[PDB]
Amino acid sequence: KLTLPKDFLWGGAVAAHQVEGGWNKGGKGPSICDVLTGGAHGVPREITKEVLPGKYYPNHEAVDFYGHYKEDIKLFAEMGFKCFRTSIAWTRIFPKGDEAQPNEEGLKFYDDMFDELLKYNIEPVITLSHFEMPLHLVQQYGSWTNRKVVDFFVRFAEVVFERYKHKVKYWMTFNEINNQRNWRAPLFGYCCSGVVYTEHENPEETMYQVLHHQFVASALAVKAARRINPEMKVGCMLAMVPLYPYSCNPDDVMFAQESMRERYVFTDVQLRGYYPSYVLNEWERRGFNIKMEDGDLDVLREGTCDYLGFSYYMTNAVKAEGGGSVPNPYVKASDWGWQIDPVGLRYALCELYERYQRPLFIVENGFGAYDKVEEDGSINDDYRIDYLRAHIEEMKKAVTYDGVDLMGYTPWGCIDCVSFTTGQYSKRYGFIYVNKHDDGTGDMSRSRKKSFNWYKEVIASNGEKL
Amino acid sequence: KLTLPKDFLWGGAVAAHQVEGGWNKGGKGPSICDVLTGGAHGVPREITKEVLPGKYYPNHEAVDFYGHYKEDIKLFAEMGFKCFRTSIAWTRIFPKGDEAQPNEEGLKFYDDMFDELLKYNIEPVITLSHFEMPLHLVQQYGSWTNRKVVDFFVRFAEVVFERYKHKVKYWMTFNEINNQRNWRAPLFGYCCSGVVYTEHENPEETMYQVLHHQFVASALAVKAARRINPEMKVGCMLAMVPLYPYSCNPDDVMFAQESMRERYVFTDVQLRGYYPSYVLNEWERRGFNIKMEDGDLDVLREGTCDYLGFSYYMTNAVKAEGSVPNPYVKASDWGWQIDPVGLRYALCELYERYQRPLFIVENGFGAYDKVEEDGSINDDYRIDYLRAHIEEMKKAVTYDGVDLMGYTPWGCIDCVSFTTGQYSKRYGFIYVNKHDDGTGDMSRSRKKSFNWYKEVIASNGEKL
Ligand SMILES: [Br-]
Ligand SMILES: [Br-]
Ligand SMILES: [Br-]
Ligand SMILES: [Br-]
Ligand SMILES: [Br-]
Ligand SMILES: [Br-]
Ligand SMILES: [Br-]
Ligand SMILES: [Br-]
Ligand SMILES: [Br-]
Ligand SMILES: [Br-]
């Protein structure tokens, strides 16, 4: 029969600010999430002006990957990871973002991390910006609204490409860059770009300006990496939630088609190297005015990403008249309402590959669920195994049947991490359980869930034994 | 205030074999359609070994565009056509297909037609192969299944490319090349490529072999046109029936996505320049062996088409052919579902996929026409259809930002139908007095849609 490529990149994914902790160790400056309080169901996270002693900030400690990384990596090697995806904490390299020189201690930290990873033959996959820019850049410059932040990010990228030019083969620029396309939401704009759009006179115009600065920063980074070491691959990162039309009503089919542009505009620019006519038309209609410098458009054409990294978790259904979507009655969903749609993965893979004809990378996938530690210490997470297995099956299909070019697969929060929306521990994704809880209890120790040995066998059989 | 481009190519579209007549005049040899009998509802058209006396062949006479072209064109100009789409009858240039020299008479005929068109500032849009290849190539060489036909087709393209290099700006290689992807249907394979696939031991493998030859031929033709006059645009021609997932069931959605590849594989090759991985995978699955020659893949990459010409009439909904009636749309009396939004959808999908200029080379409403006592034909129904479609078309261009060259409604002058070869199913703004029973005098007259469309062009789409 046919199987995945022998060198398929099976691994695991996390983000610095979601696991590391040590938020103020080694000279690291505060990031936008270090002033983001923990939340819960019905209780949103709060942005504070500074770190308030009375408040709870879950990213400060997270799961202490900063201290446990050597041992955690030994666990990754036990599962047999071919690669590991995390981010380089921007604030560990430029604590404020505008320093004349980088923070040496930060650079050493990641030298050590990548060394361990390579010791076990684990290829680092690094996201340059993953919801954790320096607070100072937001407070002093107005964040990505300011062209200067472009320069700051490029300096950051330049320093790290060179430092780890022989240690890191795979890069991505801006994590889930399209989350913020939803500009009414309280935290997509903030975590993406340190900008809350509804707090501006022209929220949408402000959005497109930030996007432009980031597209240009991404393109400038690609070129930088090419000059430093053209063997390295730098991809974009798209949060891929496919939108099904609820029915075969032409209005529904057409609404979904136009709505998918909220995703595609980002890859269109980052992969094709220019603003697609459909977005330029919108700017006209809305009378937006996006400040560009001479050369920007050239920069975009010359610095398109090399591969399409994306996260997949779920699918949505949309109606032309109604809502801003509606639950798909043909699929089940997690305890947090995230729809379970493995076929949607094959759909996303086929759609993305047919549109761009460039290599794809599934850099996020996983099932957020509660875990119960049994009397004997085991954690039976068959619910998570069922999810991942169904997705891997569909993923395999898109590769061996549909002919999609797929680089690899890295399930999200491969070790339990602080959640994004609520900053809780209780919503778990990991193969490795971390003893840390919402009320602050726990000793931070690790233990293997049932999904641990299962995913081990997955990689050993190159995805043939599920 | 936004509108279509000032130079939008409004026009009309027909096919040589469906309008011309004079099937054996001017040295013209018999085509595959010259042996295709007329039919009707529940009575399939028949292919005969040769021209049989007691048999009816609608394409022999058609509507006599051969004799009426000058006067017909005058009617085109009256509506104010910016362009006119037709095909060059392969058999008027190479009557049997394998002649070393072209038929001068055939060439002069199109010099005359093109001269008339250009007399009225009408830009010819010429389809090289439109369901009318030389019978002889089919009988003697086994048609497109034979590699020799590639060179025959290219010889043909080269002759006409050179002859009209200062008269024709817009070409297309193969008309609705994807119709034959439905290898079971009795006519698509035969009309597209003179091959009935079910009559072969490996229908599908035979099909992909035919397609490879035509993909190469198309590319070779594009390369040939570039050398002759790089200002000429050579496009492809896809029959576009969007497939909607019946419901948001992931299985319907996925099924629809994969099914659309039956369209996209053709434009993928002709526009992107190579065989998409998904079809190459199907071949390995099925064990097919498509015979290729060194440089073929090079040819495909070098001779991609400039623009995507396509036809649109309808959409289908699919459930995991797998079709099911779409409960949200109406249909013509011939079952063709009416879905103007589908056009906009087709334009956006095609454009977002290839980012190449599009060209709506066919769109129409086939229906009965009644002549009123005073000679007038009230075809409100046809106008209704055309208007709804033009409106969504305008949205795709001015709202969505699709790059669109023009728009030429099908059978702009009444023509012989494809499926049945009848006159009764009319598409035109111009009525032709000729009927299924053979009665009529071939005279032309204007339908209500004549002046309506006349105003569409004058207002560049702003007065509908
Ligand atoms: Br505060
Ligand atoms: Br400094
Ligand atoms: Br907990
Ligand atoms: Br013969
Ligand atoms: Br048929
Ligand atoms: Br077969
Ligand atoms: Br080759
Ligand atoms: Br189909
Ligand atoms: Br509009
Ligand atoms: Br009739």
Numbering used by the authors:
A (entry chain C): 5 to 327, 337 to 479
B (entry chain D): 5 to 324, 336 to 479
Article, verbatim:
In all, we determined 23 structures, four of them not deposited in the protein data bank. These novel structures represent enzymes involved in stress response, specifically methylglyoxal reductase (YghZ), as well as three enzymes important in core metabolic functions, phosphoglucose isomerase (pGI), 6-phospho-beta-glucosidase (BglA), and glutamate dehydrogenase (GDH). All the proteins are oligomeric (YghZ, pGI, BglA, GDH) and belong to three different fold families. YghZ and BglA have a classic TIM barrel structure, pGI adopts an alpha/beta fold, and GDH possesses a core Rossmann fold found in many nucleotide binding proteins. Based on these experiments, we demonstrate successful structural characterization of multiple proteins using only microgram quantities of purified material.
6-phospho-beta-glucosidase (BglA), is a cytoplasmic enzyme and part of the glycosal hydrolase family that is able to hydrolyse aromatic β-glucoside phosphates into glucose-6-phosphate and a hydroxyl aromatic in vitro. E. coli has several predicted enzymes in this family, whose physiological role has not been fully described. BglA forms an 8-strand alpha/beta TIM barrel with the putative catalytic residues Glu180 and Glu377 located in beta strands 4 and 7. Additional density was noted in the active site and a sulfate molecule from the crystallization conditions was well ordered adjacent to the putative catalytic residues Glu180 and Glu377 and formed hydrogen bonding interactions with Thr434 and Trp425. Modeling glucose-6-phosphate into the active site based on the position of the sulfate molecule revealed residues likely involved in substrate positioning.
